[PDB]
């Protein structure tokens, strides 16, 4: 382990056989600055400030991931085709700010110990699926080389409105349901 | 994104140092400085590269200014083989090369003992065919083309008789005409006063 | 030289035709680049492939396309040829897709010449001019002159051969060929070279001197209607023996 | 104009 | 019954301490969750971490242009980008929203950066606090509870010129 006032990943390069799929992002002090949409060849900054004052050429992400794809192919042969082990994720649901009935809030669903980086995070309101007002972070790195993803749900707090965070991963024996009610 | 500027041409004297400048005020912290060379009509070939620190290698040296707003390619001793087009290119990660127009370097030999003369050479197959040779003139002499349609005059050309430690300049003139004399073949050119005519 | 090979070395084709340029990168090199060097636009980058997939694009025309096979060799295909496509096409190779410190290794290039018709393509006439005895008596040196004349295009390689071996000391070839009719757009060229030996070297009848001119012309698969010999790629020579 | 962000490049595994 | 997956991660990390004075880089080449090779700027050469690493670290160390780029990345990546953070990220200061709602809980939400201190008459010694909560949208959260006159919550954060006090009754 290394200790410092600040830790930045410039950046997090991920490529895996399942899909195949890749991820390119930069992090600072544990928060994601941006990600590159590898299909749209576009840099997506995570703050209005970054969008207004910073710039990353997406062409460098794509080229990096191309080398990862080459590297993975070589190392699969070297490791005598050793596949990834599935980890059990840890799901936590909590609000963004204090709950006030009739005051727009955000439910935060933290999914930690993701490995491999393949996950389905969804929301439920009174047992039924919710797509309206849902958004999530990219896979965020960890020192142990597992990941964490955070999912959000904008909602209006009310009585007779129970919430759930449904997580699907190969590390689980059944889809994890993390409940939340105010 | 950041581009370089260079002189379009430079003329240097043989055996003297060559300092090819490059300008790049707009350089980024992420940009490396590269120099490539190209002889005609061969492919470009790498010379040197650097970031901030001055670099030295077998081919050349590279001086980068403290503010990194300019650089210089140093040839410590010019050679006639050094005449080529020199490209100062900015490199960053995987971005593509932009060669730009570069500097056409021409190297001129110091002719130690000039002996300007015009000679006539007959063809090895047929005696009737004739070529004129203006040779051994100093590099300050300039060979002008013919003010005739039936007469062809080549530009100067430097040969190196290495073992003899001898270089010489020459241009060749020829024509189809029977009355084509060598004594009046390079008269449109500024031939030296001391030029020998056999 | 650099380990990058390119085929064909020279290419003459008519307008509207298609050409396929081949490029073999260096062993171990996984990235391939294509450049076009013209008089009009200079050295321009066209395309980059890495591990058989497109990695970078320059200002390449839709009628221009490239590929990189599993053996990492590459092919540049140029369709619906125009006179302006007449240039030098270079390919380069590199280990990785590129870094700020990584070298690009270049091939020798392909000289592509797009013509309206091949009817104006001519091989050269070569001649050797024996040293002036006036030069010998004055400098104690002997200059031999060579004259390659009336060739089209200016795709030629002139070399000097003393006693069956190529020489480079005392040799001087014109850097550019001259236009015989400076007015005409289809004019034939001339190219001269000099070889200077000692008076006593030339004055030896045992010494053979040969001026060799390599002409890059038409293909064996190219059609010829004209009642003159097909101006195919060929060697044209002129020799001279020493004079006592 | 905003200055372009720097980034590390992965070194490429030996193909041979 | 689960799909087969082979994962590769390349991590180029920068560690900054005491402004621009101390800077250290670590590049990590990971097969699945196993780091097999790495370049630490303090070492200055690629090192094999597991027996999967010697064919890559020895190869990269034999190529001058690979060692020169990796070494120069301390300047072309870490140092370059830290000046870009100085003007944006490091100047980002979001003041917290402090409220008390009855066990009396003082909720300190949506603040940036991490550096926070919360105190609770005189300060008490019997308070249960949450660990620092990372919301993941560049804002933090911290909740301080207290068991069982005027009750006051004292919050200190770099964004504030003076600590924010919230009272009860
Ligand atoms: C912290 O870093 C100082 C370096 O100076 C600056 O501050 C940083 C925050 C950053 O902005 C950077 O770019 C600046 O350059 C150190 O001080 C320097 O130390 C050298 C060597 O000892 C000394 O010769 C310099 O005069 C001194 N510069 C300054 C600006 O003070 C700190 O070192 C401590 O303080 C010094 C004054 C000195 O007493 C030294 O022995 C101390 O270690 C660094 N502090 C720590 C805690 O490491
Ligand atoms: C995610 O959802 C799709 C459709 O329901 C499914 O095919 C896929 O396997 C799921 N992945 C995981 C990790 O459960």
UniProtKB/TrEMBL annotation, chain A:
Its main location: membrane. Keywords: Adaptive immunity, Disulfide bond, Endosome, Glycoprotein, Immunity, Lysosome, Membrane, MHC II, Signal, Transmembrane, Transmembrane helix. GO terms for cellular component: endosome membrane; lysosomal membrane; MHC class II protein complex. It is found in: Endosome membrane; Lysosome membrane. Residues 89-169 form the Ig-like domain. Disulfide bonds join 109-165. GO terms for biological process: adaptive immune response; antigen processing and presentation of peptide or polysaccharide antigen via MHC class II. Glycans are attached at residues 80, 120. It is a single-pass type I membrane protein. Belongs to the MHC class II family. This is MHC class II HLA-DQ-alpha chain. It comes from Homo sapiens (Human). The lineage of its organism: Eukaryota, Metazoa, Chordata, Craniata, Vertebrata. The chain holds residues 2 to 183 of 227 of the full protein.
Automatic annotation (TrEMBL), chain E:
It is found in: Endosome membrane; Lysosome membrane. The keyword Manganese does not apply. Coiled coil: none annotated. Disulfide bonds join 14-78, 106-153. Keywords: Adaptive immunity, Disulfide bond, Endosome, Glycoprotein, Immunity, Lysosome, Membrane, MHC II, Signal, Transmembrane, Transmembrane helix. Glycans are attached at residue 18. It is a single-pass type I membrane protein. GO terms for cellular component: endosome membrane; lysosomal membrane; MHC class II protein complex. The keyword Glycoprotein applies. GO terms for biological process: adaptive immune response; antigen processing and presentation of peptide or polysaccharide antigen via MHC class II. Its main location: membrane. Residues 96-169 form the Ig-like domain. Belongs to the MHC class II family. This is MHC class II HLA-DQ-beta-1.
């Amino acid at each position: 382990d290394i200790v410092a006032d600040h830790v930045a990943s410039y950046g997090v390069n991920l490529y895996q056989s399942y899909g195949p799929s890749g991820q390119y992002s930069h992090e600072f002090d544990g928060d994601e600055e941006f990600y590159v949409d590898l299909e749209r060849k576009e840099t997506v900054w995570q703050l209005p400030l970054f969008r207004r004052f910073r710039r990353f050429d997406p062409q460098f992400a794509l080229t990096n991931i191309a080398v990862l794809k080459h590297n993975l192919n070589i190392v699969i042969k070297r490791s005598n085709s050793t596949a990834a082990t599935n980890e059990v994720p840890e799901v936590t649901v909590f609000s963004k700010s204090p709950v006030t009935l009739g005051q727009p809030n955000t439910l935060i669903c933290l999914v930690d110990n993701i490995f491999p980086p393949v996950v389905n995070i969804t929301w439920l309101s009174n047992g039924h699926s919710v797509t309206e007002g849902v958004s999530e972070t990219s896979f965020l790195s960890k020192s142990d080389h597992s990941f964490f993803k955070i999912s959000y749900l904008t909602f209006l707090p009310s009585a007779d409105e129970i919430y759930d965070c449904k997580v699907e991963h190969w590390g689980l024996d059944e889809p994890l349901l993390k409940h939340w009610e105010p | 994104d950041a581009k370089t500027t260079q002189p379009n041409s430079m003329e240097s004297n043989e055996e003297e140092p060559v300092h090819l400048p490059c300008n790049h005020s707009t350089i980024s912290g992420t940009d490396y400085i590269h120099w490539y060379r190209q002889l005609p009509s061969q492919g470009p070939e790498y010379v040197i590269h650097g970031l901030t620190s001055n670099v030295n290698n077998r081919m050349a040296s590279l001086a980068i200014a403290e503010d990194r707003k300019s650089s210089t390619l140093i040839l410590h001793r010019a050679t006639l083989r050094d005449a080529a087009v020199y490209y100062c290119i900015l490199r960053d990660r995987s971005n593509q090369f932009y060669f730009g127009t570069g500097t056409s370097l021409t190297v001129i030999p110091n002719i130690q003992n000039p002996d300007p003369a015009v000679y006539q050479l007959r063809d090895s197959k047929s005696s009737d065919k004739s070529v004129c040779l203006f040779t051994d003139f100093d590099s300050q002499t300039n060979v002008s083309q013919s003010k005739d349609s039936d007469v062809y005059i080549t530009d100067k050309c430097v040969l190196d008789m290495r073992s003899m430690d001898f270089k010489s300049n020459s241009a060749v003139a020829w024509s189809n005409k029977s009355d084509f004399a060598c004594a009046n073949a390079f008269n449109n050119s500024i031939i030296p006063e001391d030029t020998f005519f056999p | 030289d650099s380990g990058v090979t390119q085929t064909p070395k020279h290419l003459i084709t008519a307008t509207g035709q298609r050409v396929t340029l081949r490029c073999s990168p260096r062993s171990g090199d996984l990235s391939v680049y294509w450049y076009q060097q013209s008089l009009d636009q200079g050295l321009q980058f066209l395309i980059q492939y890495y591990n058989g997939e497109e990695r970078a694009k320059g200002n390449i025309l839709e009628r221009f396309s490239a590929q990189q096979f599993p053996d990492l060799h590459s092919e540049l295909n140029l369709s619906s040829l125009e006179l302006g496509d007449s240039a030098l096409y270079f390919c380069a190779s590199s280990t990785t897709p590129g870094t700020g410190t990584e070298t690009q290794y270049f091939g020798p290039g392909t000289r592509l010449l797009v013509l309206e018709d091949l009817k104006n393509v001519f091989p050269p006439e070569v001649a050797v001019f024996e040293p002036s005895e006036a030069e010998i008596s004055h400098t104690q040196k002997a200059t031999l002159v060579c004259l390659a004349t009336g060739f089209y295009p200016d795709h030629v390689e002139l070399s000097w051969w003393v006693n069956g071996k190529e020489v480079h000391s005392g040799v001087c070839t014109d850097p550019q060929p001259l236009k015989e009719q400076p007015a005409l757009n289809d004019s034939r060229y001339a190219l001269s070279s000099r070889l200077r030996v000692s008076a006593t070297f030339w004055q030896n009848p045992r010494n053979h001197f040969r001026c060799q001119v390599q002409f890059y012309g038409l293909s064996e698969n190219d059609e010829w209607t004209q009642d003159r010999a097909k101006p195919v790629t060929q060697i044209v020579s002129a020799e001279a023996w020493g004079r006592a | 104009a905003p200055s372009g962000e720097g980034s590390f490049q992965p070194s490429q595994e030996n193909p041979q | 019954d689960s799909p087969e997956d082979f994962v590769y991660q390349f991590k180029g990390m920068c560690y900054f301490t005491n402004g621009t004075e101390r800077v250290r880089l670590v590049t990590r080449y990971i097969y699945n969750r196993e780091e097999y090779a790495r370049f630490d700027s303090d070492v200055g050469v690629y090192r094999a971490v597991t027996p999967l690493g010697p064919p890559a670290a020895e190869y990269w160390n034999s190529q001058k242009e690979v060692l020169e780029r990796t070494r120069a990345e301390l300047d072309t990546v870490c140092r370059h980008n830290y000046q870009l953070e100085l003007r944006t990220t490091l100047q980002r200061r979001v003041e917290p929203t402090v409220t008390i709602s009855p066990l009396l809980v003082c909720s300190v939400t949506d603040f940036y950066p991490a550096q926070i201190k919360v105190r609770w008459q005189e300060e008490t010694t019997g308070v249960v606090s949450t660990p620092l909560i990372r919301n993941g949208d560049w804002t933090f959260q911290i909740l301080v509870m207290l068991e069982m006159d005027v009750y006051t919550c004292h919050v200190e954060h770099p964004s504030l010129q003076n600590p924010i006090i919230v009272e009860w009754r």
